Design a protein around this ligand. Structure first.
Ligand SMILES: [Cl-]
Ligand SMILES: [Cl-]
Ligand SMILES: [Cl-]
Ligand SMILES: [Cl-]
Ligand SMILES: [Cl-]
Ligand SMILES: [Cl-]
Ligand SMILES: [Cl-]
Ligand SMILES: [Cl-]
Ligand SMILES: [Cl-]
Ligand SMILES: [Cl-]
Ligand SMILES: [Cl-]
Ligand SMILES: [Cl-]
Ligand SMILES: [Cl-]
Ligand SMILES: [Cl-]
Ligand SMILES: [Cl-]
Ligand SMILES: [Cl-]
Ligand SMILES: [Cl-]
Ligand SMILES: [Cl-]
Ligand SMILES: [Cl-]
Ligand SMILES: [Cl-]
Ligand SMILES: [Cl-]
Ligand SMILES: [Cl-]
Ligand SMILES: [Cl-]
Ligand SMILES: [Cl-]
Ligand SMILES: [Cl-]
Ligand SMILES: [Cl-]
Ligand SMILES: [Cl-]
Ligand SMILES: [Cl-]
Ligand SMILES: [Cl-]
Ligand SMILES: [Cl-]
Ligand SMILES: [Cl-]
Ligand SMILES: [Cl-]
Ligand SMILES: [Cl-]
Ligand SMILES: [Cl-]
Ligand SMILES: [Cl-]
Ligand SMILES: [Cl-]
Ligand SMILES: [Cl-]
Ligand SMILES: [Cl-]
Ligand SMILES: [Cl-]
Ligand SMILES: [Cl-]
Ligand SMILES: [Cl-]
Ligand SMILES: [Cl-]
Lengths: 218, 218, 218, 218, 218, 218
């Protein structure tokens, strides 16, 4: 990663590596893996990001899908940033291609140069953007449950049902307004009859705290 | 977090991440989780705080309630800080909205800029304030016991009873004067008959050390 | 904690937090917990000290007694340092109250300002003084044994007896001269008959090394 | 490793050493070992690289093959960089031989001098290049499976088959275009009859996400 | 500990504390504990040394003997450094007493001042000297074996016998010349008959490598 | 260890100590222990080296042989560097003796002074040289196998045989040309009949990769 105020390079730490390998080995592609990844790659160069992706053993289907997604994003970047012919001037550096952002056709020195330029070309945050896009696709694809099948059991405490519901919902990754609708309709629509009666008596604009309060002892 | 005297940014450490994930996995929403959180987020940007909140897998009902609370606090902040139209002057930066404090509509650079300004706009401590507010609500809601039901057993050592009583009391989170009353009335009112007689003989203005001393061998 | 020679602030480390939580969970209130605490809070602000105290889950009776002790010390400090009315001058800062030293009515910036002033107002070491006072009271109260009941067994090696004796003695926390008397009288007075005869033959001014040497093979 | 902007030397850390020893002891020569190695040797001198290679106990056949490969690369470097006779001028340093890059005939000071020169002679990245070349040969040789023998089972979920296929493929280390052909032909050619029919119905230019989607419930 | 070239103070680290507590809990008073202690207290102030000594729970007999030894050394220091009456001059600091070196009557600031003075008064290394003296006494006293009782078994490999012999010898802590004599006489004098014959045939001035070589297959 | 470009002293770290103690406790005197030692003592003073050697509990026969070797090297150094009488000039420091390099008759300040002088007297790397010499002698002496007794089993895969062969060879520590001969003759001479026939058919100048390839399926 790159960390008076001058930005300087730093090798990826063994604690970062062990934490990334560990969370991938433990939690596969549960949603919380994506912020953890984002947490462990703060300020990372494309080289660091490729380092974390390549240290993943197994799950090579998902890693291959991630490669496909990264290639699509690189191709779109190339389409929106046509390269200019000519000798790079002294005091300047070439503008990056899609593969330069992905770290496969650029050196570490070129990445450092882009990231510390005035103004900065943040190839690290762009690449991380693409990676997180692909990770979202994988987390969505590998989710075992659908939000339409989360129904509260006849004896299931309301808290556990809400836990399952919002876990699945987080895996869905639909737009914010769509999730507003799902919370607005399915959560009460799929509760068990007693709690469902109580929640109907609560009212349309009910917060989650009020709903969980109403069905506590129930 | 942000840490000559000039304040500088720093990526959240793997030891911080592992400690937060670990304490959430172990202790759920026991009261001591809240200072631990506050301990691990010292000087955190809103990005760091969102990082710790998002790495929590499971307990998605509580995380959703936390989202609701944060939204209420953001709306109140917007109501008390009406935004001003106009171009941001060179040498200044825009004043944050509620969602800018919550880190969802502001960059890391804008957060750093607010936090290191003269005078400082401490969006990190404000956001942490809101988060801790929501965490207090969750700890209160998930507490299994009520302070009115803590009664000393006929053979229960006074120390264990006081432990249960003040644990539950800490979970209650009532105002200071209300807790003064609960200590003033319930603790002796709910002791077992022998210890209760001794404590009555102690006197109204008895400290906890005196009370535990009086019922030691008893 | 606060650490060219200029003193600068630092967030409490996850290794410090985990070590404190761990030693409290393991050893409860054995005497060695108090230096360990003092070890982990070197240069701590009142905020850091409150952080370590608040992360303790359970033992809420002892934590409540600690709160009482801290309140007494704060009240005495207020009685010996009467506050002065008037506007704080530019280039100065208000003198702290008892609750400001305890960190409950002062900001982190005010604590830093007092601790780095010329001359320094060491609110951190004062607060730690009060805390260690209360911890000593708790360690004394929770000790299971009394120094008058430590008697060497008929077959008990002298080393084990001395270990028990000085462990209990350390828990007693009596004044230095009182402990001089206890070592002077009880240790030989409570030895088993054979070792007791040998130690009587040693002489009044016998060191511990000589005494343990004399009853080795015995 | 070597890490204002001035590059400075640093001893290899115990966390790096323990991580390298650990991953070699655990994963032998699975492909992911090579990026991990590259991760733990960022900015390493030839001395650091030899340190990591020499700490490997066992697998001495592979370590010997690695020695052979490094010797070949050193001999080629010597053939392409003929040495020049004459006294090294004040303000200059000798140009390295193959064995100087491999760290066996050069001091740590000479390596530091080459790596921090203007312009730099990056003996560390050259040596790491050779080492990774040999590691690739070993990973290829020790792979238990061939890509032509990966066939989907009659009841095997398509995800598991793709996992095995791309794992083996990663071990193959063939050129990019050859792997394009293998993905293009073998993956569907070796699927089970039902999934194979579906994938044939998908079309020639099918991405992995589409293929795995089509054979999900199947 | 105290660590441009200016010496600066530093709080004792949790890794140091945990390592010291761990080695004391594991190895009691085996000889290797003393260098480990010396290793973990490099550059320590008397406050740090007292911190490590006080964190030891149990073994209070040995800790009490250590207190006695430290008191003797402090009294001797006071006898050889008579204090001078008079006001301490501006730009100077008082000369330390024995108890000031032991850290019980001196502040951390006074210790820092002595240790960083020109010329330095190294109270930390003096105190560590006294402590290591007492630790040597304890290791000597608690050793279970005597060097005169180490005899090679009739079937015991010579290597194991030499291991026991030099372990016990290290616990003896006799002067260098005395240990020269013990190696010179006892080692062969106490070997088993066959090895003893071989070693007699070796010659008087035999090194340990030659002796262990001669009785290898034997 | 000693680490703008100015070299500065540093206390040996608890992670270094724990790693050294751990690897000695685990692997005894396998060859890989020697580079690990060299890894953990990078830039070490003689004090640090003596610290690591002294923390080894047990194996006191080997530690005693190491002492003998270090004494021989010190005596040779004294024979080749005769000391000069006279007062050390202001701005200079005395030239070290053999025992000064071994750290037993020199202070830490004198070692630091030699190591940071212009030009440098590298007592740390000299002492480490002697230590590694003695460690090589011990690893050679304690090796359980001889290279002439490594014979491939009738059903033993060629890879395992080569592993045993080069492990033993590494323990032999013969000169480079001698090991060239051992690889040249014994490896094929001691293979099992079938593999031996294949390797004979390969040719005299066969690399290890070719040999292991030829006897793979065999
Ligand atoms: Cl994995
Ligand atoms: Cl999965
Ligand atoms: Cl890779
Ligand atoms: Cl851009
Ligand atoms: Cl952009
Ligand atoms: Cl579910
Ligand atoms: Cl419920
Ligand atoms: Cl969780
Ligand atoms: Cl819970
Ligand atoms: Cl998230
Ligand atoms: Cl404000
Ligand atoms: Cl505010
Ligand atoms: Cl309870
Ligand atoms: Cl009790
Ligand atoms: Cl606890
Ligand atoms: Cl307790
Ligand atoms: Cl709290
Ligand atoms: Cl004061
Ligand atoms: Cl004061
Ligand atoms: Cl007892
Ligand atoms: Cl005894
Ligand atoms: Cl291994
Ligand atoms: Cl293998
Ligand atoms: Cl080696
Ligand atoms: Cl070059
Ligand atoms: Cl090159
Ligand atoms: Cl397979
Ligand atoms: Cl599937
Ligand atoms: Cl202990
Ligand atoms: Cl013991
Ligand atoms: Cl103490
Ligand atoms: Cl002195
Ligand atoms: Cl002195
Ligand atoms: Cl023995
Ligand atoms: Cl033997
Ligand atoms: Cl050992
Ligand atoms: Cl061994
Ligand atoms: Cl020693
Ligand atoms: Cl020299
Ligand atoms: Cl030399
Ligand atoms: Cl073997
Ligand atoms: Cl094979």
């Amino acid at each position: 990663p790159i960390v008076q105020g001058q930005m300087v390079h730093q090798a990826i730490s063994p604690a970062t590596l062990n934490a990334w390998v560990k969370v991938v080995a433990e939690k596969a592609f549960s949603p919380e893996v994506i912020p953890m990844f984002s947490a462990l790659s703060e300020g990372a160069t494309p080289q660091d990001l490729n380092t974390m992706l390549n240290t993943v053993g197994g799950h090579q289907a998902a890693m291959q899908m991630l490669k496909e997604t990264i290639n699509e994003e690189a191709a779109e970047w190339d389409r929106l940033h046509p390269v200019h012919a000519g000798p790079i001037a002294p005091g300047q550096m070439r503008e990056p291609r899609g593969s330069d952002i992905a770290g496969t056709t650029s050196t570490l020195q070129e990445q450092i140069g882009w990231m510390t330029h005035n103004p900065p070309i943040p190839v690290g945050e762009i690449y991380k953007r693409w990676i997180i896009l692909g990770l979202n696709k994988i987390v969505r694809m590998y989710s075992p449950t659908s939000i339409l099948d989360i129904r509260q059991g006849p004896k299931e405490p309301f808290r556990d049902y809400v836990d399952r519901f919002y876990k699945t919902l987080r895996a869905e990754q639909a737009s914010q307004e769509v999730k507003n609708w799902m919370t607005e309709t399915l959560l009460v629509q799929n509760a068990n009859p007693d709690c469902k009666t109580i929640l109907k008596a609560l009212g349309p604009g009910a917060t989650l705290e009020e709903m969980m309060t109403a069905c506590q002892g129930v």
